[PDB]
Amino acid sequence: KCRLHVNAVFMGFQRAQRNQYPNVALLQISGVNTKEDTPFYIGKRVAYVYKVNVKKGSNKPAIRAIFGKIVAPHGNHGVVKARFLHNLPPKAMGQNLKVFLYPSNI
Amino acid sequence: IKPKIVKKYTGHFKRFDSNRFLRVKASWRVPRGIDNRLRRKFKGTNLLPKIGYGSAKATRNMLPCGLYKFPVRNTTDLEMIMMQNRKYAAEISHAVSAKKRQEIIQRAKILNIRVLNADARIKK
Amino acid sequence: VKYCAKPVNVAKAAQARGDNLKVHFKNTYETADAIRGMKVARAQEFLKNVIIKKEIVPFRKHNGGVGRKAQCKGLNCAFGRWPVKSAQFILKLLKNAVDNAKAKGLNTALLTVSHIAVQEARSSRRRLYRAHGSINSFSSSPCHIELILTEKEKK
Amino acid sequence: STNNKVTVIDCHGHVLGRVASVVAKHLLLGQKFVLVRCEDLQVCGTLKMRLVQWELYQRKRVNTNPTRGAFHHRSPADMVRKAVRGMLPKNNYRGKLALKNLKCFEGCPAPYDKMKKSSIPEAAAIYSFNPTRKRTLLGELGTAVGWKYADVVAKNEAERKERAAKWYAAKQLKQKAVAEAKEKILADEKYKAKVAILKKFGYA
Amino acid sequence: SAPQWFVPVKAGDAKVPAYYPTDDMIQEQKKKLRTRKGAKITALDKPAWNLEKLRKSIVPGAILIIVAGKYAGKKVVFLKQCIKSGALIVTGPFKINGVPLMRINQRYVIATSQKVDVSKVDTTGVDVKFFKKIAIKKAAFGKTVEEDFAKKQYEAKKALIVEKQKQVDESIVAEIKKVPYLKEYMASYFTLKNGDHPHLLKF
RNA sequence: AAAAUGAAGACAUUUUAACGAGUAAGGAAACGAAAUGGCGUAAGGACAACAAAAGUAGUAAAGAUUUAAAGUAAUUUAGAU
RNA sequence: AUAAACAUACUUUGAAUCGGCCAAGUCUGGUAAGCAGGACUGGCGAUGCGGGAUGAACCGAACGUCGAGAUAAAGUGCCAAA
RNA sequence: GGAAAACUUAAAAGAACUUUGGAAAAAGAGUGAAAAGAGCUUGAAAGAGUAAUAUGUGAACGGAUAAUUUAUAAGAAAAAU
């Protein structure tokens, strides 16, 4: 109906050269090209909506979501840190997430 | 009321090389080799039982229902926990016959004690 | 020796078995795998072509040194042989089971080979006199065979 | 959402390595790329130096079996795929999937010849190069090493330029009439209320 | 007296010890679970202590964009704040948007600069009593089963009061039509087109 | 380690503070504020329904296969066959 | 001057060990050696972790089980976080 | 010089008649509390066979983190004055 979100790319987890900490996920919000535009998005909602091909004998929904929040910037290029209720599956790397306009402060 | 029972490690501490050889069982044994990959705590293989893994003293040995297990062999052994039915749960031993099980199961209902083997050796 | 599986409806099944059969396990294990699931009439035709070397038995698992043949196209196996002795033994058990079905009163034209399983048996030892004053073992490879025929019905 | 549209990169007047590095990173970010005219990319060094580097590259080869050895692709569309594949993860599903969304062509083929082309400013040869430094088109180097289809491409590109010449001329005629027709609506008095709104915000 | 840990229960003629009283003198007590006290009911005028502080941009008569929930993207007019819940009582005038009278928490709205003001909106009712009156509750647990048709009849019954209380729309609708293009603005969804980056979007 | 409490609760008490890597090697048992804490195999002497029929067992023991639970771990417990 | 009461002084009984190896704003024999032998200290042996692509010794820093942050050596075109 | 090899059941009641097969045997039938069926109490691991399920480019296995599927699994009380 209407677009009320900004597409964000799940680049990967907060890691080191030979380590990886899947508790914090890194996102690239479309339109943020510097760390001085991130303060708007600190605290906004983020959802990882995905589709599962359920069977006709299951009541499990075909559309599910994992929700989280943006907590801090990550480097001088407008990359963010997002903490989710359940850590995103690494099979979802490079996929698109939703950055909502709420909880609004405007 | 029931406290939040927190476990620091829900897996099992398997023996080293237990997955590769069938003569080495899965029961844990600290490796005492001079070149052992595990006892030297390498990257990847550095999982050993330590005292720090122990769970909280408040909730130790507590069943998920929130009560402590208490084995009983007869109806008389139930009377030892009838004052503490909010702390202990009965447990009919594995060798107790089906006849003696009905008396234990019935009596615990009279004394308001939770039995965890209430569905054991039930007839056809 | 018991049976690996029991039929769903004992009233519509027939059984036959052989214990300590003096036939190679690896040859009879591969033959039995070929006739699994086909109708009794088709199976008896397949086992007869194998005897006169007109249809192949694909040796799928035990194919070390087994030569390639022209009849093994379409079976995803490049190797096959024509074990006669194992084919004959199964032919006698398939006949025995069919006579058991007829006595029960089942329609032979409807039966299929639903279950057929081969298991290893106790071997017999013999001497092979090698060089430098040695003796080796010259051991048989017998097997047990179980057969169950059940009528095919829609589900 | 899902990125189904394809980013088209016009590899004309770009640097081979700097295009690959930006393309390789964004392949891991789920984007779909199609680099057309991958034969017009430029590399540093004259033709003689490029041949010395190529001859050294051709040396690496499995001694006991050259058919197992390194395969030295000579088509420029394969000189960019090799460059991009070097910058992507090796021997995992993440690397294979990222490379599955990449294509070079030696020109603009049928579906990608009428698509919105993009550019990578970091990889532009006019920014990263001293103008006096001598370069080499990947197509010119390909011919010197055995790429047979260099003159087939030059024929196809020539017919693409001439077909876009008539489409652009016809489009420029229509767009001029549409622009002049709009100026009459702007000057019209019935649309005075709407025009004032546009003038207020500078759109007019 | 009985010990604190002794709650005698009836025995179905089964064997009992000597000390256990016979059931003819045993009276059962209904099992009790709840122990906390529900919220006290106060004056309709006085506000609850748990009252959120509204942002300075949200003032009565403003036009808000709902960015979450069922009416995501719709535009509503902010009448007043529910003192008993801290939620905003907004009406996205039903004759224009189709958004009825409802309570929405202040974190799911954006306070635009555009204002319709409108005093004399006749908010005599429209409070905790009204919203609790028209809310569609479930059929509880022991109150039979009553599937399917139970929810439909609730809406039919609450429809007459829900429609009646929408009389608040009479004046704001008139003021909305006064400003040019304002009717279209509210009647349409709010969408993020290409190039509208929220960190740059100002309303 | 130091304070407080202490015939029996219990989780080998309560509080505060500092500390915890490790081959060869050492720290036997007992020791109420316990001079390290525990698991398992087998046999011997006791204890095991306190009101004169007193641990379990043909209403299915030991053993075997697995499913779950408790324990950091050694292991223990229970269900099904 | 500074530090030191879980400080200090120990007594008894006893285990393992005395094949060592490396570094260097060090030395001796040797053309020289990843050679042979020494003075002082630190390490490896007995030692994992982050970095140097990989490495017994190099640099940072020594380890009960976890969460959140500020860091160290060193890095920020892609593989690879910046 | 110098071994190996214990156990059906309470009782042989150790199938006994029919069909297929050259025969051994098999399928019915019958005994017995139960085939425990004589290679006979129970019947592990290594090795196989059948069925169900799932996976795949020059090893396989292990660990941390999530997703999918399956399994386990938490309730009968009830507000203000």
From Swiss-Prot, chain E:
For biological process, the GO terms are:
cytoplasmic translation
Does the record carry Ribonucleoprotein as a key word? yes
**InterPro entries tied to this protein:** 60S_ribosomal_eL6 (IPR000915), Rib_uL2_dom2 (IPR014722), Ribosomal_eL6_KOW (IPR041997), Translation_prot_SH3-like_sf (IPR008991)
The protein's location, in the record's own words, is: Cytoplasm, Cytosol; Cytoplasm; Endoplasmic reticulum
SUPFAM superfamilies in UniProt? Translation proteins SH3-like domain (SSF50104)
Name the keywords, alphabetized.
Cytoplasm, Endoplasmic reticulum, Ribonucleoprotein, Ribosomal protein
GO molecular function list: RNA binding; structural constituent of ribosome
- Please give an example of a GO cellular component term from this record: cytosolic large ribosomal subunit
The protein's job, in short, is: Component of the large ribosomal subunit. The ribosome is a large ribonucleoprotein complex responsible for the synthesis of proteins in the cell.
The similarity comment for this entry is: Belongs to the eukaryotic ribosomal protein eL6 family.
The record's note on quaternary structure and interaction partners says: Component of the large ribosomal subunit.
Q: What is this protein called?
A: Large ribosomal subunit protein eL6
Q: Which organism is it from?
A: Entamoeba histolytica (strain ATCC 30459 / HM-1:IMSS / ABRM)
